[PDB]
Scaffold this active site. Structure first.
Site, PDB file in Angstrom:
ATOM      1  N   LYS A   1      51.596 115.424  65.260  1.00  0.00           N
ATOM      2  CA  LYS A   1      50.414 115.037  64.468  1.00  0.00           C
ATOM      3  C   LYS A   1      49.116 115.084  65.296  1.00  0.00           C
ATOM      4  CE  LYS A   1      48.855 111.527  61.260  1.00  0.00           C
ATOM      5  NZ  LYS A   1      48.271 110.494  62.201  1.00  0.00           N
TER       6      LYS A   1
ATOM      7  N   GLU B   1      18.573 114.110  69.009  1.00  0.00           N
ATOM      8  CA  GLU B   1      19.896 114.590  68.543  1.00  0.00           C
ATOM      9  C   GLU B   1      20.450 113.703  67.416  1.00  0.00           C
ATOM     10  OE1 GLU B   1      19.787 117.772  70.321  1.00  0.00           O
ATOM     11  OE2 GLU B   1      21.962 117.501  70.199  1.00  0.00           O
TER      12      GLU B   1
ATOM     13  N   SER C   1      49.575  99.573  67.051  1.00  0.00           N
ATOM     14  CA  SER C   1      48.597  99.973  66.093  1.00  0.00           C
ATOM     15  C   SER C   1      48.612  99.095  64.826  1.00  0.00           C
ATOM     16  CB  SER C   1      48.800 101.437  65.733  1.00  0.00           C
ATOM     17  OG  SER C   1      48.430 102.267  66.813  1.00  0.00           O
TER      18      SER C   1
ATOM     19  N   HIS D   1      48.395  98.327  73.483  1.00  0.00           N
ATOM     20  CA  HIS D   1      49.850  98.294  73.636  1.00  0.00           C
ATOM     21  C   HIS D   1      50.510  96.910  73.639  1.00  0.00           C
ATOM     22  CE1 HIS D   1      49.803 102.781  75.120  1.00  0.00           C
ATOM     23  NE2 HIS D   1      49.583 102.670  73.823  1.00  0.00           N
TER      24      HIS D   1
END
Ligand code: HEM
Ligand code: HEM
Ligand code: HEM
Ligand code: HEM
Ligand SMILES: C[C@@]1(c2ccc(F)cc2F)OC(=O)N(Nc2ccccc2)C1=O
Ligand code: FES
Lengths: 241, 75, 49, 60, 49, 64, 378, 54, 54
Positions: free
Chosen positions: G226, G270, G204, G200
């Protein structure tokens, strides 16, 4: 040793994505468990109450539990007595130890059969192929004869004698009890023993896909509605001179 | 923390917008949509695909070789 | 592990200098027919066949 | 001769109160209708469940 | 000179009820809000389930 | 027992015949000398692979 | 004034989820952050409801897991939601890291470096959980991973015996692992808040790698809806796993109870650990292998220093794009080799894939960025 | 909340899980507590504003 | 461990067998009491000094 063969794909009534177990075939397969397997195999995680939903009535399963004696914890003397058998009790144990299992079966331990479908690659296909796939050894290969030939078992030498061509069982509906059919029923049952949720899982599965078929286009239409403002926006640049 | 009014200086840009209630959520969805995905595929295939094919070829060789290594023919 | 004479002969014949962890067989066993081991691999602790 | 979307808006969607009331009445009636159909679809696919249980009950 | 600013044609993106420039949009606003709010209503019902 | 019916019908099919013969030419090979290592595990597993494949497609129509 | 804007609690929600200036142009690939947060809360809720019935003794651990799946009302969906949620978590982790790599999002130094910590913390979390049902793979997986510490010179044996509470994986080990597995996702949740705080500061990145201050939109309604759509796609993929293929990613040996005396012949992780497992066993040395394994994850912390391009993103960089996709396909190859026995073609190709992994990152991608600069006369 | 007709097996295990989670929830509510406090700062013995003598 | 058969025994195991399990166990039990002593002093402060106006 070293070399392996892998099981084929049998078309069980319960294979496909929305396909339940045949519960008539569960009913017959319990009977295979009780008659044939339970003398050597533990099934520590199925009790008589589990059958009540599935393949028997409440009265039927009470009567099947009534066939065996249990051992209940003590009265006032501090005693341990034997008991006619209930519904809360688990499937009965052939042996007190793993070592007692090994002592009966000439060193080999018969594994617990509660999870054996989910505990082997191939599932029911492997177990079916193990049961219906007993043959003579090829030339080059001698055993102990304490150990027995199976091409599906890893190493080829299984400590289990064929339990299967023996033409056993009280049948009620009264279908023919061939080696193929006795193996079909037991594997159908052993799936159920591994996975009691199978039928509910798939009913939920349909309900999910139908809901997602509604909800995915609708949420998409909601996101397209809000984003419309942006996706159709026009820009113009108008600098001085 | 960044806030509207304090981001950057912009001069001389007009934006025109319509209400979502005035307009289509799926405007020319197949007729303009599938030409665009085709154009996007073309633009990227030569960058994306050739590593994965080179995996697939090493996969199919490697599985075939190992299977064929676990066999004799004389002793 | 009870040891055949062929095995005891074979482990006497191994070059001590050429090994990762250099021991003779004679310093490892109290009496040469009996080899006793913790059955745990020194790499990552799996049980060797 | 006005539209059904227009009526569903005017009577029910305009107030958030009635909009919420529509969804909750909608959800109760939907839960019944969806479960009833989705059982019956699953039931028609399968037929070895306790479809059989006429055999073993009622004798009791 | 600001008077040269016409708004560009949105006919490509417009709902069929609001393409006619000589028709009031008021006549279709009930139907159009009806459709989009029915979408959100149907969703909330599904999500509630 | 309808497994017998189905295995007989499977052995008819062309891939199984060539694997029976490759096993047969292993049977003959392994008799023929006093000390050999060779096994015929590989030749048998080859045949049942082709046989049980066809078994799986057909068997369950018989079983009730 | 709004309530939303200046209420001391609603302030934080406002600046994170409502009024947050977001790039107009962020794709699908930016959905994975919210999806990782969803994955964390999913693992929290199902995990608590499992902790309500699970017991952590060796005598009863397998049985209590069995009890969940037969006897506890809807214990099976909760159990399988959890097991497959862990896989969903790693699918989202890998898509998210890959986005960061391709788009130059790692230039946010502090945000990225915390994401590495987040990755090492979920890895430790999911390892300790997998141990808990006390199957065969639980036990030998516990054995192999814990023994990685014994390669550390001088102190290594003392360190592993300390984390065992004994001479092997035993009673002390399982109970430990339950306690550590409970605490660590709450620590994750706190580090995820610190991650979001650092982010922040800048907002982005976007597909283009160009500053988007000129074209910011509010987070709500755009990325709220979204992210909703993204979550419903996560629910589809999770529910497909739980309701149609619950054992697809599970090892069948974990359905057999833990045996301390006998390994499985195979032994495989895994799916999400198979690349690192391939990297470890590529080295014919004990210490060499573990150091290679550690360095295969920890390399992400060096990716900022190996940025060489004058452009942030790989969007305008065809050379780097080819080399990135070569990394992804190398990782697919390493996941393949991870899941296979230590035998003839697989050894040498596993070695070559391991070399190429470190060659792409340390050498080849920083050479591509320099060539691309020279090509653009930059 | 029992998981049964009395305090039993289901109750104890439940209580372990709830007892583990709740102090982390406490820790989060304690941070929210401290946030609300920092809007005003502390009260003092006199109950009079102390802005003049911080 | 959180089973009825083993809950008492595991607490006993802490206090005899686990290295310094007794101090940790008793630090915990008495820490809970310390927590309530501090809670009550803190609430009482709030009451007396009008700190509840926050
Ligand atoms: C009854 C038709 C029956 C079934 C079904 C069955 C299953 C079965 C499985 C799946 C195995 C596991 C093989 C594996 O490890 O992959 C197995 C193992 C043994 N059994 Fe069995 N079993 C059936 C019945 C019987 C009966 C009646 C006996 C006694 C004659 C028997 C014994 C054993 C033994 C011994 C083994 C261990 C083999 C080994 O690993 O060497 N079973 N069973
Ligand atoms: C506990 C798992 C994690 C959570 C919950 C999470 C949280 C998120 C969120 C919410 C976003 C914003 C939306 C988005 O861009 O996706 C984001 C962005 C970011 N994350 Fe994570 N993250 C985690 C794992 C990671 C990892 C493993 C890394 C890489 C080492 C990473 C590095 C970053 C970076 C660099 C961005 C900036 C992206 C950009 O704007 O382009 N995070 N994180
Ligand atoms: C703090 C919330 C959590 C709690 C209380 C918790 C608790 C549990 C419990 C009780 C088990 C044992 C039962 C079982 O195996 O089904 C389990 C196993 C598991 N945990 Fe968690 N868990 C939490 C979150 C996590 C997270 C964040 C991950 C990493 C994605 C994780 C990964 C798993 C895995 C892989 C297993 C093994 C599942 C299996 O195959 O059976 N869990 N956990
Ligand atoms: C989880 C236990 C709690 C923690 C960790 C805690 C935390 C604290 C802290 C650090 C302070 C600042 C220093 C001080 O004045 O003591 C404080 C002040 C305050 N606390 Fe708490 N608190 C808790 C319990 C409570 C309770 C039970 C109440 C009463 C219902 C209370 C009401 C307040 C008030 C009104 C103040 C303001 C005091 C003033 O400045 O005079 N707190 N809290
Ligand atoms: C789930 C798993 C795992 C998760 C995350 C991680 F970073 C490492 C792991 F090994 O935990 C575990 O015991 N295995 N299994 C395993 C580990 C080493 C060798 C063989 C199996 C995993 O894959
Ligand atoms: S070689 Fe790795 S544990 Fe033995």
């Amino acid at each position: 040793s070293d070399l392996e063969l892998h099981p084929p794909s049998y078309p069980w009534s319960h294979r496909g994505l929305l396909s339940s177990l045949d519960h008539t075939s569960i009913r017959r397969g319990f009977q295979v468990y009780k008659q044939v397997c339970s003398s050597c195999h533990s099934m520590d995680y199925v009790a008589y109450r589990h059958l009540v939903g599935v393949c028997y009535t409440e009265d039927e399963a009470k009567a099947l539990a009534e066939e065996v004696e249990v051992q209940d914890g003590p009265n006032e003397d501090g005693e341990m007595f034997m008991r006619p058998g209930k519904l809360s009790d688990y499937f009965p144990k052939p042996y007190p130890n793993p070592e007692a299992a090994r002592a009966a079966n000439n060193g080999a331990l018969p594994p617990d059969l509660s999870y054996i479908v989910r505990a082997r690659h191939g599932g029911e296909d492997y177990v079916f192929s193990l049961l219906t796939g007993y043959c003579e050894p090829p030339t080059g290969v001698s055993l102990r004869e304490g150990l027995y030939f199976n091409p599906y078992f890893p190493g080829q030498a299984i400590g289990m004698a064929p339990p299967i061509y023996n033409e056993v069982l009280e049948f009620d509906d009264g279908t023919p009890a061939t080696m193929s059919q006795v193996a079909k029923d037991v594997c159908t049952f052993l799936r159920w023993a591994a996975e009691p949720e199978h039928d509910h899982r798939k009913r939920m599965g349909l309900k999910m896909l139908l809901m997602m078929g509604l909800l995915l286009p609708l949420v998409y239409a909601m996101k397209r509605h809000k984003w419309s403002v942006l996706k159709s926006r026009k820009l113009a640049y108008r600098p001085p001179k | 923390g960044r806030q509207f009014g304090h981001l950057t200086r912009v001069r001389h840009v007009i934006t025109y917008s319509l209400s979502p209630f005035e307009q289509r959520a799926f405007p020319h969805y197949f007729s303009k949509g599938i030409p665009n995905v085709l154009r996007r595929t073309r633009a990227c295939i030569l960058r994306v695909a050739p590593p994965f094919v080179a995996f697939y070829l090493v996969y199919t060789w490697g599985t075939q070789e190992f299977e064929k290594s676990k066999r004799k023919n004389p002793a | 592990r009870h040891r055949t004479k062929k095995e005891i002969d074979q482990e006497a014949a191994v070059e001590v200098s050429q090994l990762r962890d250099p021991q003779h067989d004679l310093e490892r066993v109290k009496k040469p027919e009996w080899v006793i081991l913790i059955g745990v691999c020194t790499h990552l602790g799996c049980v060797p066949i | 001769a006005p539209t059904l979307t227009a009526r569903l808006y005017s009577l029910l969607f305009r107030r958030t109160s009635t909009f919420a009331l529509t969804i909750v009445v909608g959800a109760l009636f939907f839960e019944r209708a969806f479960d009833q159909g989705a059982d019956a679809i699953y039931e028609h696919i399968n037929e070895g469940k306790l479809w059989k249980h006429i055999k073993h009950k009622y004798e009791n | 000179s600001h008077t040269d600013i016409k708004v560009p044609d949105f006919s490509d993106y417009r709902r069929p009820e609001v393409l006619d420039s000589t028709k009031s949009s008021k006549e279709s606003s009930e139907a159009r809000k009806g459709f989009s709010y029915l979408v959100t209503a149907t969703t909330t019902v599904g999500v509630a389930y | 027992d309808p497994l017998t019916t189905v295995r007989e019908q499977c052995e008819q099919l062309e891939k199984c015949v060539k694997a029976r013969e490759r096993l047969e030419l292993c049977d003959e090979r392994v008799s023929s000398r006093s000390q050999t290592e060779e096994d015929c595990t590989e030749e048998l597993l080859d045949f049942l692979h082709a046989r049980d494949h066809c078994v799986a497609h057909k068997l369950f129509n018989s079983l009730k | 004034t709004n309530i939303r804007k200046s209420h001391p609690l609603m302030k934080i929600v406002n600046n994170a989820f409502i009024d947050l200036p977001a790039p107009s142009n962020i794709s699908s690939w930016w959905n994975f952050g919210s999806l990782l947060g969803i994955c964390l809360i999913l693992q929290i809720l199902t995990g608590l409801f499992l902790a309500m019935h699970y017991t952590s003794d060796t005598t009863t651990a397998f049985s209590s897991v069995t009890h969940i799946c037969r006897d506890v009302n809807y214990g099976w969906i909760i159990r399988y939601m959890h097991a497959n949620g862990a896989s969903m978590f790693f699918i989202c982790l890998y898509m998210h890291v890959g986005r960061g790599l391709y788009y130059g999002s790692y230039t946010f130094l502090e945000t990225w470096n915390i994401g590495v910590i987040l990755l090492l913390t979920v890895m430790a979390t999911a390892f300790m959980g997998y141990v808990l049902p006390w199957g065969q793979m639980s036990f030998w997986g516990a054995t192999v991973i814990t023994n990685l510490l014994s390669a550390i010179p001088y102190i290594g044996t003392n360190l592993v015996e300390w984390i065992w509470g004994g001479f092997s994986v035993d009673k002390a080990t399982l109970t430990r692992f339950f306690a550590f597995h409970f605490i660590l996702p709450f620590i994750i949740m706190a580090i995820a808040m610190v991650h979001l705080l650092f982010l922040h500061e800048t907002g982005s990145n976007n597909p283009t790698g160009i500053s988007s201050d000129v074209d910011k939109i509010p987070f709500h309604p755009y990325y709220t809806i979204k992210d909703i759509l993204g979550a419903l796609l996560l629910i589809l993929a999770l529910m497909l796993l739980v309701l149609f293929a619950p054992d697809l990613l599970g090892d069948p040996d974990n359905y057999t109870p833990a045996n301390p005396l006998n390994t499985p012949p195979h032994i495989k992780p895994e799916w999400y650990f198979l690349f690192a497992y391939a990297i470890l066993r590529s080295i014919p040395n004990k210490l060499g292998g573990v150091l290679a394994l550690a360095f295969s994850i920890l390399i992400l912390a060096l990716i900022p220093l190996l940025h060489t391009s004058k452009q942030r993103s790989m969007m305008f960089r065809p050379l780097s794009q080819c080399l990135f996709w070569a990394l992804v396909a190398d990782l697919l190859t390493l996941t393949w080799i991870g899941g296979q026995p230590v035998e003839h073609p697989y050894i040498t190709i596993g070695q070559l894939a391991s070399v190429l992994y470190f060659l792409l990152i340390l050498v080849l991608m920083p050479t591509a960025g320099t060539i691309e600069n020279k090509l653009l006369k930059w």
